[PDB]
Curated annotation (Swiss-Prot):
Pfam families: GASA. Expressed in peel and pulp of fruit (at protein level). Coiled coil: none annotated. PANTHER family: EXTENSIN, PROLINE-RICH PROTEIN, GIBBERELLIN-REGULATED PROTEIN 10. This is Peamaclein. Belongs to the GASA family. It comes from Prunus persica (Peach). Keywords: Allergen. It comes from the Eukaryota. The lineage of its organism: Eukaryota, Viridiplantae, Streptophyta, Embryophyta, Tracheophyta.
Length: 63
């Protein structure tokens, strides 16, 4: 992503301790989705694109 989403995901991750990797992933998940919710869980409302994100175990491929 760019600096435009840097603020979107930047929020999604901050108190993760390793957001460094989050911002990385989210950044991509933000590139595929093209949108990201503002907040740490419970904000998906804005963009559930992150909530729908599910893997084989239905888990969020992203952080």
């Amino acid at each position: 992503g760019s600096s435009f989403c840097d603020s979107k995901c930047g929020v999604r991750c901050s108190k993760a301790g390793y957001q460094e990797r989050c911002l990385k992933y989210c950044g991509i998940c933000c590139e595929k989705c093209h949108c990201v919710p503002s907040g740490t869980y419970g904000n998906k409302d804005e963009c559930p694109c992150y909530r729908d994100l599910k893997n084989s175990k239905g888990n969020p491929k992203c952080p």
